[PDB]
Paper text:
The MERS-CoV ORF4b protein is a viral accessory protein that functions as an innate immune inhibitor and strongly localizes to the nucleus, despite virus replication occurring exclusively within the cytoplasmic compartment. The MERS-CoV ORF4b protein has been shown to bind preferentially to the nuclear import adapter IMPα3 in infected cells, thereby inhibiting NF-κB-dependent innate immune responses. Here we provide a detailed, structural basis for the interaction between MERS-CoV ORF4b and its innate immune suppression target, the nuclear import adapter IMPα. Our results provide a detailed structural basis that explains how a virus can target the IMPα nuclear import adapter to impair immunity, and illustrate how small mutations in ORF4b, like those found in closely related coronaviruses such as HKU5, change the IMPα binding mechanism.
We found that, compared with WT, a MERS-CoV ORF4b mutation of Arg24 to Ala (R24A) bound only at the major site of IMPα2. Strikingly, with the lack of minor site binding, there was a distinctly different binding register at the major site. Here, the major site was occupied with a canonical Lys at the P2 position (MERS-CoV ORF4b Lys30), and indeed, the 28PTKKLR bound at the major site represents a very typical major site NLS. B An Arg24Ala mutation within the minor site, denoted in bold and italics with the numbering below the mutation is presented, showing a loss of minor site binding and change in binding mechanism at the major site. From this quantitative experiment, we determined that R24A at the minor site binding region and R33A at the major site binding region both reduced IMPα2 binding to the greatest extent, with binding affinities of 238 nM (significant ~20-fold reduction compared to WT; one-way ANOVA followed by Tukey’s test, p = 0.0002) and 471 nM (significant ~40-fold reduction compared to WT; one-way ANOVA followed by Tukey’s test, p < 0.0001), respectively. For example, mutations within both the minor site (Arg24Ala), and the major site (Arg33Ala and Arg37Ala) resulted in the MERS-CoV ORF4b binding using a canonical Lys P2 involving 29TKKLR33, with Lys30 binding at the P2 site. These NLSs all bound with reduced affinity compared to the Arg P0 site. We found that mutation of R24A alone had a small effect on the nuclear import of ORF4b, whereas mutation of R33A alone, or in combination with R24A (R24A/R33A), significantly decreased the nuclear localization of the mutant ORF4b proteins.
Numbering used by the authors:
A (entry chain A): 72 to 496
B (entry chain B): 28 to 34
Amino acid sequence: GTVNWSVEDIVKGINSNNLESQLQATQAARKLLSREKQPPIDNIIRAGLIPKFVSFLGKTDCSPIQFESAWALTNIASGTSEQTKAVVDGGAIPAFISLLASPHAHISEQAVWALGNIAGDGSAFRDLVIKHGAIDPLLALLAVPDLSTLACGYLRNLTWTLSNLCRNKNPAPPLDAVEQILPTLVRLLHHNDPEVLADSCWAISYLTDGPNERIEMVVKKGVVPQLVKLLGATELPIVTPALRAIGNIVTGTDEQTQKVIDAGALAVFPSLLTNPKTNIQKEATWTMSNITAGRQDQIQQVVNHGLVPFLVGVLSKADFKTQKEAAWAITNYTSGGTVEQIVYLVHCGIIEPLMNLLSAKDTKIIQVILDAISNIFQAAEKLGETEKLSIMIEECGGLDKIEALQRHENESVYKASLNLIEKYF
Amino acid sequence: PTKKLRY
């Protein structure tokens, strides 16, 4: 009946003075815009149908056309920034916010979805959705004693849209909006559905991707233990955002990093640092690198959890980006660590892989490795064991690589290699 | 997952 309509027929039906003909044409448009391959979004926009759909959003006496138009506009807004902008320019934001309070669950859900697409466009439309007052009705939809009484898809869409309201930077979401959303976000973070948990973790990862004040806003809500628990989850879609959020948090102050440590995060890193998913290994090694840049007691907790052998493993064999994060972790370790911690690092077998990595082409990893080696040599000097370290480096073939770096294009690598050779070789 | 189309 409403399958495979032409845009011309849809326009003829929508321009009729007959609400039922308009409803059927709007459903035909929804089905066109809901097809798998290249839905004709631009054709629908050029036909000038967005204002009519927006007007239909307000037909309280005809809920079917409200639903069909909300679906069509959702799918239009799911496209490029220009198509989302076309939806916004038609006045859709306040109409969808008004529909949030609809007595029909599917219409309210579709409005949630549409606002999620609009806000997901970027910071500007995110803040514009916020300015139109979406947060209060959105959160009211979740003001129930037990989230389990809500439909699974409804709750998933609400969580996803809220996560989009927490998303993007330059600027980050308004502080007042974040404070208004965070309690519901914690409650969702304690939900049992895997997709709700994944999207709540993504929202938290967005909110912790910023200055230490945002990280503090998040951590003061007491979510770090739940984040660590989810870090231990089996579902990769949950582990990925949980690990992102934990890394973000440990980029903050040493006290926030210590909050991460106290929750038991380090105990998960034996698996994370050996995870078969390359992205997980890279993110876990980056988190470790930011943890080793902390206090000597935090470096010591890293030691106690037996994670130095795992860092040596990652440095010995892993994707090059993970190996670079591991080199950064080693350099931070050596910069902030005690002489005892540095000699332990050496006893775990760091020198051979660290030297093998000096054959890479990237300059920055070379500089990082040279700085780490300088710090290790300084610790050895303090112990008066510089000759043993020099012999170790010379045996693994590292002295040859250092001499070959003396003729490098970068001035920093040049000078660092020459200084090492002049001081210790 | 910035945007999603409803199929």
